[PDB]
Design a binder for this molecule. Structure first.
Ligand SMILES: *[C@@H]1O[C@H](CO)[C@@H](O)[C@H](O)[C@H]1NC(C)=O
Ligand SMILES: *[C@@H]1O[C@H](CO)[C@@H](O)[C@H](O)[C@H]1NC(C)=O
Ligand SMILES: [Cu+2]
Ligand SMILES: [Cu+2]
Ligand SMILES: [Cu+2]
Ligand SMILES: [Cu+2]
Length: 483
């Protein structure tokens, strides 16, 4: 793997992760993008070298480092026209930030239009030398990262959508390439694995299970939690989980299954599937049967390892500022409280540094306060369920999707939450991270359609807390000169 100091060169190339050839986005000449790695407290210097020539997938790029807090380095966070102008082709831009107090499973991806759907997306693992669950597993390496990804034969900016295939570790089969190579995951009988599940999906959620094995979940979106055995896991776009697998079954091949909520909802011919292979097992497809899932993961039954409480007082409205976000759908555009987000000419953070634009979308947040955000599900926002995600913060899921109850005493903490179907998912966080932070649904087409708002956190202090490198100031004129 690479990092925490590395070059990321972005280019275009042919790929065939399902046997069908299409042009896509490469990171250091490989599809899918390589895993980045660091220890807790490393300083990260990821030099992003834009060498793209393909206009249909945009020649420009910017990278968000999903989950990282970016305290004092809001300029480094990624979202085009919120925190930076995009890097232009022929140029490079250094992302220089630290991760002092985060550790766990994360990822990086394009935050420009729909560009990460064309293959610029990759796992990040920040190991903890003192990890609290270390004693529960023997192996925790590059071989135990598992990524889930949707794959489309025609580019993001080519059709509307429906995945042609599911990619586990970059490999999978579509309905017309049932013979294509599958992803193989190799364990040794009697060893224990910390598997790091990473959804790179642009849209589908996956119900993930492994034939013949139970999963003990110990981490969600970077947050250590109390161990919790399950036999399947619903993972929504941009979410992460660590589960320990006790490789204690017979030496054999076992189907790994990852079934999307949309499109091809079967396992016929090994679509939506990969292979757990015990060492010594033959190089064949598994022939194992799947059991009905009798202990699925339940977000409202998850709790933080330390049992941390929700910020604020343990009662609704028991907070410094309650904001309710009302979803809708106008032209071809999503709306929250009546605003559709259109990317502004001057990125928000630059406006601050210079009411913010785009009007109707920007929410001033005071510092050192408790915030409660409501996001009731509604049929007025088609394409639900929507997984909303808050940059620059972990939040406490005081009430999950599918539930009516309210947990303030020890709710799970996360950075991406399913908001459910027409449900009133509510979250809490403390404002200790001054800057403009994107709040948006992570189904990436809905995002390009404007399904987003920006939290302008402690705006009087953003100028002081986030000094900006010369290279970042150079970004916008360069971009604006391009036709
Ligand atoms: C650029 O990528 C698009 C999207 O996959 C593809 O349709 C097009 O052929 C590519 N351009 C070239 C010159 O290969
Ligand atoms: C969701 O919860 C907030 C919290 O008070 C409330 O104001 C809002 O009306 C609720 N919406 C629905 C649809 O239940
Ligand atoms: Cu993300
Ligand atoms: Cu993010
Ligand atoms: Cu959505
Ligand atoms: Cu985002």
């Amino acid at each position: 793997s690479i990092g925490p100091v590395a070059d990321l060169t972005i280019s275009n190339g042919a790929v065939s992760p399902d046997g069908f050839s299409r042009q896509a986005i490469l990171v250091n000449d490989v599809f899918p993008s390589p895993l980045i790695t660091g220890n807790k407290g490393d300083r990260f210097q990821l030099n992003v070298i834009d060498n793209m020539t393909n206009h249909t997938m945009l020649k420009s790029t910017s990278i968000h480092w999903h989950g990282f807090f970016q305290h004092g380095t809001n300029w480094a966070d990624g979202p085009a026209f919120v925190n930076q102008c995009p890097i232009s082709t022929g140029h490079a831009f250094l992302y220089d930030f630290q991760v002092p107090d985060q550790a766990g499973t994360f990822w990086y991806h394009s935050h420009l239009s729909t560009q990460y759907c064309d293959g610029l997306r990759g796992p990040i693992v920040v190991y903890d030398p003192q990890d609290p669950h270390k004693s529960l597993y023997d192996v925790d390496d590059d071989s135990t990262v598992i990524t889930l990804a949707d794959w489309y034969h025609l580019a993001a900016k080519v059709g509307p959508p429906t995945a042609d295939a599911t990619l586990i570790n970059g490999l999978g089969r579509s309905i017309n390439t049932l013979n294509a190579d599958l992803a193989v995951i190799t364990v040794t009988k009697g060893k224990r694995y910390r598997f790091r599940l990473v959804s790179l999906s642009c849209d589908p959620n996956y119900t993930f299970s492994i034939d013949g094995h139970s999963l003990t979940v110990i981490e969600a979106d970077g947050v250590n939690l109390k161990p919790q055995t399950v036999d399947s896991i619903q993972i929504f776009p941009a979410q992460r989980y660590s589960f320990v697998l006790n490789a204690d079954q017979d030496v054999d091949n076992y189907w790994i299954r990852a079934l999307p909520n949309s499109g091809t909802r079967n396992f016929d011919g090994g679509v939506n599937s990969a292979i757990l292979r015990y060492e010594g097992a033959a190089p064949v497809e598994p022939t194992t049967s799947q059991t009905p899932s009798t202990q699925p993961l339940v977000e409202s039954a998850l709790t933080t390892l330390e049992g941390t409480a929700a910020p604020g007082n343990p009662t609704p409205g028991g907070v410094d500022l309650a904001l309710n976000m009302a979803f809708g759908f106008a032209g071809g555009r999503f709306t929250i409280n009546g605003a559709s987000f259109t990317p502004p000419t001057v990125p928000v953070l630059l406006q601050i540094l210079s009411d913010l634009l785009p009007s109707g979308s920007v929410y001033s947040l005071p510092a050192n306060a408790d915030i409660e955000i409501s996001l009731p599900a509604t049929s007025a926002a088609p394409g639900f369920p929507h997984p909303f995600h808050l940059h620059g913060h972990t939040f406490a899921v005081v009430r999950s999707a599918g539930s009516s109850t309210y947990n303030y005493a020890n709710p799970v903490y996360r950075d991406v939450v399913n908001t459910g179907s027409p449900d009133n998912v509510t979250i809490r966080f403390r404002t200790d991270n001054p800057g403009p932070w994107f709040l948006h649904c992570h189904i990436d087409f809905h995002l390009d359609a404007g399904f987003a708002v920006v939290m302008a956190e402690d705006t009087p202090d953003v100028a002081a807390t986030n000094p900006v490198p010369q290279a970042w100031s150079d970004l916008c004129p360069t971009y604006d000169a391009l036709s």
